[model samples]
Target: MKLIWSEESWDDYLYWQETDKRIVKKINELIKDTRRTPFEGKGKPEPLKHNLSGFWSRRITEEHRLVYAVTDDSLLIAACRYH
Candidate 1:
């Protein structure tokens, strides 16, 4: 699946990437890896407690995460943050 970023998420991603090279690199790698099985068995990811409608998340670090939703042929990057 392909990844498409919203403007807000893209900007947030760029900011995170600028802030910490190592953590952001890991996050990017994880996002890339998800393409192999985009949203397969997906749900709200670690650290988050509630289901977020169609959203699924992946950990970036102890303080951050990648927020996204997957469609049939692509993954929409909704946001990226520590919350």
Candidate 2:
């Protein structure tokens, strides 16, 4: 029911969306629901991921990904990159 973004996540989002609003739109859409999980991958090995109540996830992007999670407190992040 409650969602929040970390300061670093905010910073990275701002940085990436500077030239591409489409990617931002994708993230916005991804955060619209509470239990719905839809993810896009940038490429191989995965990119960024987040914890969803108990699991970490990686969402794909045009050239990268977002690491995020869903929790009671807010959205938790590990990182946003491919490995």
Candidate 3:
């Protein structure tokens, strides 16, 4: 499945990479794994609740998470940020 990033998520990623280069390496690894197996990344996603009930969240680290929702043709990345 294809992966699309939202403007906010893209900015958050940029900020994270700028803040810590180490995170960039891990982010790249996760992105690579995600493209190959969207639901089978290093960390399994947890189902969300409330308004975000349809989305899923996977931890990139204790401080960061990857939020997304699956679609017929792609995985829509809603955001990537600290909890």
Candidate 4:
């Protein structure tokens, strides 16, 4: 699926870019893996629940997560920060 970032997600990434290089690398790898196989790749991909149903999550760090949704033509990244 094609990858697309929301404004909030992009902002979160910018924060990471300025905060840590290791996390930036991990996020990049996670994005690539998510695009390749969003449902069955690295980062311990998992489906969310409650009001967040229909969205999926992948671990970015101990306290942070990468939340996204799989649409017909794209993978929309909704958030990339702490839960």
lDDT of 2 by residue, 1-83 (tens): 45555777777678658857876776565555323543332222233334334435445465555566555556664444332
Q: Write the per-residue lDDT of candidate 1 for residues 52-74, one digit (tens) a residue.
A: 67777776766667888778888
TM-score of each: 0.76, 0.55, 0.80, 0.90
lDDT of 3 at 38: 68
Clash pairs detected, candidate 3: none
Worst 10 residues of 4 by lDDT: 34-43
Judged by lDDT against the true structure, how good is candidate 1?
A: 0.71
For model 2, the stretches where C-alpha displacement exceeds 4 angstroms are 33-55, 77-83
lDDT of 3: 0.78
* Model 4: CA > 4 A from native: none
- Deviation in Å, model 4, residue 44 alpha carbon: 0.7
Alpha-carbon local distance difference test for all models: 0.71, 0.52, 0.78, 0.88
Model 4 over residues 1-83: C-alpha lDDT tens digits?
67788889999999999999888899889888977887888789999999999999999988899898988879889888898
After superposing candidate 3, which stretches have Cα over 4 Å from the reference? none
Report the alpha-carbon TM-score of model 4 versus the true structure: 0.90
